[PDB]
Design a protein around this ligand. Structure first.
Ligand SMILES: *[B@@-]1(O)O[C@H](CNS(=O)(=O)c2ccc([N+](=O)[O-])cc2)c2ccccc21
Ligand SMILES: [Cl-]
Ligand SMILES: [Cl-]
Ligand code: NA
Ligand code: NA
Ligand code: NA
Length: 262
């Protein structure tokens, strides 16, 4: 609709920032796109690709997910809600994946990154899936600086929506691994104020949020609307001021705009 485009442009104008949206509606294989080829700092939405890389690795390495990883004081970073409870013990790669995806734990993300060989390995995994846009450059916490004009640790809404479709609804991962990713995302604890806040209460969502510098506020989701084919929605938002506050309401508003009528 021209109307949906006008509404997204009006939302962006009023928000004061830069908004990126990609909706894929699998009912009819249609898309709604807004700045969908521009780059945005992913922040913690990048944790989906890191967990998926570990899941892919596990397809050839049974018991990979049970492998123990030491958590040390030296591993702590700036947001460690789960890992701080396990200092001086180990967590399994499954537990680290769940902590990264469901609590957005940054130690957990760093362990996923390290396990697969670092940010360039996460990026190479994206390339193997056919995503030639995603780039993970840094580890936690520096990957969240979100400086305007900086391509590090960015992707586009179109690419992330297409890749998330592949990961959650398509065949990027084996059936067990795909189901595990979906189960983890459906159990996310951090997304109630973002895409979920713009959808009817009855709809089921698996999502991963991200927040960072420049008031960057993001969410990527697979959505099961009541009695409808699933949707994929990416909403990325960033602001001009280094210390801008988060704007999860902008993501909720974008979600409402693009799903009105469904
Ligand atoms: B990354 O973007 O995710 C974590 C946590 N982000 S957060 O903004 O601190 C947050 C948002 C929402 C919730 N919630 O439960 O609703 C909890 C935390 C992170 C931290 C630091 C840097 C990057 C990321
Ligand atoms: Cl409702
Ligand atoms: Cl977040
Ligand atoms: Na980023
Ligand atoms: Na991407
Ligand atoms: Na959400």
């Amino acid at each position: 609709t021209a109307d949906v485009q006008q509404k997204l442009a009006e939302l962006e104008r009023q928000s004061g920032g830069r908004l990126g949206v990609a909706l894929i509606n699998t009912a009819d294989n249609s898309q709604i796109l807004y700045r969908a080829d521009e780059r945005f700092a992913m922040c913690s939405t990048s944790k989906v690709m890191a967990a998926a890389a570990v899941l892919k690795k596990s397809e050839s390495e049974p018991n990979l997910l049970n492998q123990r990883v030491e958590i040390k004081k030296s591993d702590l970073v700036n947001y460690n809600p789960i890992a701080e409870k396990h200092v001086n013990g180990t967590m399994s790669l499954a537990e680290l994946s769940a902590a990264a995806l469901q609590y957005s734990d940054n130690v957990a993300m760093n362990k996923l990154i390290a396990h697969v060989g670092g940010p360039a390995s996460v990026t190479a995994f994206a390339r193997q899936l056919g995503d030639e846009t995603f780039r993970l450059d840094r580890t936690e916490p520096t990957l969240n600086t979100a400086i305007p004009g900086d391509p590090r640790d960015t992707t586009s809404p179109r690419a992330m929506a297409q890749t998330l479709r592949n990961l959650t609804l398509g065949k990027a991962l084996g059936d067990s691994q795909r189901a595990q990713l979906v189960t983890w995302m459906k159990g996310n604890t951090t997304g109630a104020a973002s895409i979920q806040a713009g959808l009817p209460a009855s709809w089921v969502v698996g999502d991963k949020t991200g927040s960072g510098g420049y008031g960057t506020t993001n969410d990527i989701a697979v959505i099961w609307p009541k009695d409808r084919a699933p949707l994929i929605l990416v909403t990325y938002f960033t602001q001009p001021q280094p210390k801008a506050e988060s704007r999860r309401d902008v993501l909720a508003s974008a979600a409402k705009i693009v799903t009105d009528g469904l």
